[PDB]
Design a protein around this ligand. Sequence first.
Ligand SMILES: Nc1nc2c(ncn2[C@H]2C[C@H](O)[C@@H](COP(=O)(O)OP(=O)(O)OP(=O)(O)O)O2)c(=O)[nH]1
Ligand SMILES: Nc1ncnc2c1ncn2[C@@H]1O[C@H](COP(=O)(O)OP(=O)(O)O)[C@@H](O)[C@H]1O
Ligand SMILES: Nc1ncnc2c1ncn2[C@H]1C[C@H](O)[C@@H](COP(=O)(O)OP(=O)(O)O)O1
Ligand SMILES: [Mg+2]
Ligand SMILES: [Mg+2]
Lengths: 732, 35
Amino acid sequence: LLVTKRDGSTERINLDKIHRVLDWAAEGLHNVSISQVELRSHIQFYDGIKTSDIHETIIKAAADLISRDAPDYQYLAARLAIFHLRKKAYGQFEPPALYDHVVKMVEMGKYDNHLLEDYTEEEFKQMDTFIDHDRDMTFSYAAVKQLEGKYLVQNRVTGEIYESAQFLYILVAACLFSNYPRETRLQYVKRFYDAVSTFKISLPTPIMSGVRTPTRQFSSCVLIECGDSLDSINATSSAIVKYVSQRAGIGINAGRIRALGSPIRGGEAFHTGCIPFYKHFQTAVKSCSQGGVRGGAATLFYPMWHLEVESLLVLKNNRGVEGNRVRHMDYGVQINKLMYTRLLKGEDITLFSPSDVPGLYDAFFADQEEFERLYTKYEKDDSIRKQRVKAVELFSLMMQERASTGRIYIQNVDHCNTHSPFDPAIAPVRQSNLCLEIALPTKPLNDVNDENGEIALCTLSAFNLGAINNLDELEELAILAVRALDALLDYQDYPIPAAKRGAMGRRTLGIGVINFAYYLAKHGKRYSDGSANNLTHKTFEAIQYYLLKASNELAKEQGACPWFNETTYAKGILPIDTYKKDLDTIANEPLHYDWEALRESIKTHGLRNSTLSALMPSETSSQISNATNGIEPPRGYVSIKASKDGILRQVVPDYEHLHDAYELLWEMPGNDGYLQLVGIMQKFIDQSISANTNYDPSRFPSGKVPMQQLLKDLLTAYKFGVKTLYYQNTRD
Amino acid sequence: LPFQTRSNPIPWINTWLVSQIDSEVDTDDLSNFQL
Ligand SMILES: Nc1nc2c(ncn2[C@H]2C[C@H](O)[C@@H](COP(=O)(O)OP(=O)(O)OP(=O)(O)O)O2)c(=O)[nH]1
Ligand SMILES: Nc1ncnc2c1ncn2[C@@H]1O[C@H](COP(=O)(O)OP(=O)(O)O)[C@@H](O)[C@H]1O
Ligand SMILES: Nc1ncnc2c1ncn2[C@H]1C[C@H](O)[C@@H](COP(=O)(O)OP(=O)(O)O)O1
Ligand SMILES: [Mg+2]
Ligand SMILES: [Mg+2]
């Protein structure tokens, strides 16, 4: 029988070629079986079978053997897949020189031509000495499939993979610091390459996927505010379409659109409602969501007191006509203290159209006192179209639609401005993003190119808490991370002018953490019992302090962000002042760093970035370092995660030693322990946290999850100053 | 034992050798709470 080699030629089938490869990939690994992989492949030999198909089959086989009893298959399947991906891009295992590769790739239009304009052949060959291609042997299988599937530069019609993993890292370092002075450029390029290639710093999907490619868009989060006009709705739709085709996820703020039945031009027209426009925002996203790095999505936000709110909460549920369903978007309900007050007192909540209540909308975010004044005043006004709903019923509907769909999110808008890095009078936060961790100021647009509008962009990265051995290493990491992201803002392109205006005036960054569950496991702490409270406070104080200190030193070198005066940092206010005081009853850990000296340096030199910290889910990017995604506890010791090919198995880091220290997601008795940690983190985080609420129906009497618990947990979340609530996971 | 400790090199042989939400709400219980 004959096999078909990679180069087209054919030779006699020889199983020793397969034994060699598998013996290589299993060397050093414990409790793996060459025989298992070959037999579980069920590889069907036929005359002329391609040798490439043979290898992909034994990769799948070795990848599905990942288990608790045999964790090391995560590296057997990774080493096989790296070997496969090496041949796919180079025709051999040995990667070429960095210069010879970039020349060929820039010539193919797969890289940005600026790489040859900014770096010389003598400089490229110097960065090839930085590269350690053996670091490809430290990936897990889930990491390699995300590289092959999303991150590595590839053709989306051919399937042709073009680069290696270490070339991706080194060129992301080269491009982001390409605009740096020669005296420290390659110095930083090496130091930042080492930081990300050894998993000290996690980089998000658009940076991994795009930084070195011609099309320059690398901000994960795009926040568009929509006004109550067709010119703004048109501008919003156009901006969504532009940025969704650019590896971005959208957050839409359509709370201003007047309710159904409202007069248009004094009664020349009858407003058909918000839902016909929400359908337009959905098709805007879906028109070009897929086809690129991944399928983009969007979350739409509206205030709880909106008149159509009872119809907007049910938009994702199946039971209804297509005319009243906009299913394929997520929604964030905006709530403030007054709304919760109506629930606690069993009173009603009056629903208004924002067009009938002047200044009520802006007060809902910027001025909590002024809102209560206007609200009760308009509640008594009989000339204003209103609608009263029992707060107990409105909350039940929302939490019920949050439960069944899982994608009805909550944003406490008053916390996002009372404890924010922005002056609500000058630049209030009126919105969040796709995953509910970004809170940045916005102003709606009049045209696609309205110079006076503002679209909020946030660029992300994460600290690998498992990778550090001492919290002071963050000082060095925060410098490398902030510098790389800030120079990225000047390096990338902006398809919408109003988006460039926000990104350049505020220079907002969103750096978070991954491997937090493994971090608690290394410290022998847990989510639910409350043993991580003081540790969490100590950990995230160091993160925010060293992040501010890094951007404050960067503000000295290149000047603070243009709109820094609009921030609360400019007025000398730190997170340690505006945090929710209820946190003092769940954490007695003291501050350890000189915050008052940092307050003075910020008062004087400013901050290069208006925001720095935000805890994102890192659903995909954390898999690169095999880290537990964000702050969420892993679902199991071997977790099942999704990919474009299929299912992926991911072992928790250091399983053999720490399988007892881990508290798995469904081993948690409730959300009170977790929610307290989110509140403690929020004491220092500039923006928000993609906090999940989890419920196991079997843990409840009669197997039904009580509405009492859904509401009691939502209140305990607000009590500790949680800004937003993301997923609600329900077991089975 | 004459040989080194080793994991089972053919684990597959062991196959053959051994053969909806409670809607009720209590606002008074929720009122026992300060935001
Ligand atoms: N269903 C429906 N909605 C419309 C129509 N024309 C405008 N709208 C919606 C879009 C906006 O949310 C809201 C306001 O529209 P514009 O602000 O573009 O209209 P204009 O400034 O001429 O009148 P205004 O005094 O603001 O109502 O009404 C229409 O013919 N049918
Ligand atoms: N499926 C998606 N499509 C488009 N953008 C996304 C998607 N998932 C996440 N994002 C963007 O990335 C941000 C952070 O999410 P995260 O899970 O950290 O991304 P990543 O998968 O790159 O780690 C979100 O706020 C969102 O803007
Ligand atoms: N004659 C043969 N019969 C069966 N399998 C073979 C073979 N020659 C190579 N293989 C296997 C070994 C590898 O795991 C896989 C492809 O690896 P490769 O070394 O990139 O391919 P090739 O040697 O065909 O260029 O195919
Ligand atoms: Mg070969
Ligand atoms: Mg108008």
